[PDB]
Design a protein around this ligand. Structure first.
Ligand SMILES: CC#CCn1c(CC)c(-c2cccc(Cl)c2C)c2c(N[C@H](Cc3ccccc3)C(=O)O)ncnc21
Length: 151
């Protein structure tokens, strides 16, 4: 390991997706740069909840199209994130939509009683995000850049 950016990203995304699914704020330290991952998570809650709320109908229609039922559909969803998220313009706007739709999908995984697929979903999203937009993420100062961008 010793990929700080991947570790920090996976943590923030797992916390958001897990707490959206279940309602509970997970109380367990944070990790390295914990004040930058707690301010990132705070921001993500504000802006991410906003995107799910404002574009609920769009999110519902996309979820319906993907027809997600098991670990096999979540594993596949990865090829879908590469086509849609990676093959686009790069900005925090689309990065939030990716993690917000992931949270929307994580809520659906809980309701269809497949909540063991949440942590893998979070890993899939972090994989596509960090190992297709690494160059851009580094240039923007990673999650310090994100928190700054949503002042
Ligand atoms: C988990 C995951 C994932 C991948 N992903 C997906 C899922 C395939 C979409 C997407 C594409 C079309 C419609 C909808 Cl509702 C969505 C969510 C997406 C995305 N969408 C925005 C457009 C948009 C913004 C806000 C609300 C609805 C739609 C875009 O393409 O610029 N941006 C980034 N990643 C996206």
């Amino acid at each position: 390991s010793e990929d700080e950016l991947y570790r920090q990203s996976l943590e923030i995304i797992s916390r958001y997706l897990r707490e959206q699914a279940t309602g509970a704020k997970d109380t367990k330290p944070m990790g390295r740069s914990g004040a930058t991952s707690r301010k990132a998570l705070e921001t993500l809650r504000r802006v991410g909840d906003g995107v799910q709320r404002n574009h609920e109908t769009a999110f519902q229609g996309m979820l319906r199209k993907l027809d997600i039922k098991n670990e096999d559909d979540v594993k596949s969803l990865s090829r879908v994130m590469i086509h849609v998220f990676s093959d686009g313009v790069t900005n925090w706007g689309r990065i939030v939509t990716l993690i917000s739709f992931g949270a929307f999908v994580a809520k659906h995984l809980k309701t269809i009683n497949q909540e063991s697929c949440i942590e893998p979903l979070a890993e899939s999203i972090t994989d596509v995000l960090v190992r297709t937009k690494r160059d851009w993420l580094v240039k923007q100062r990673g999650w310090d850049g994100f928190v700054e961008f949503f002042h």
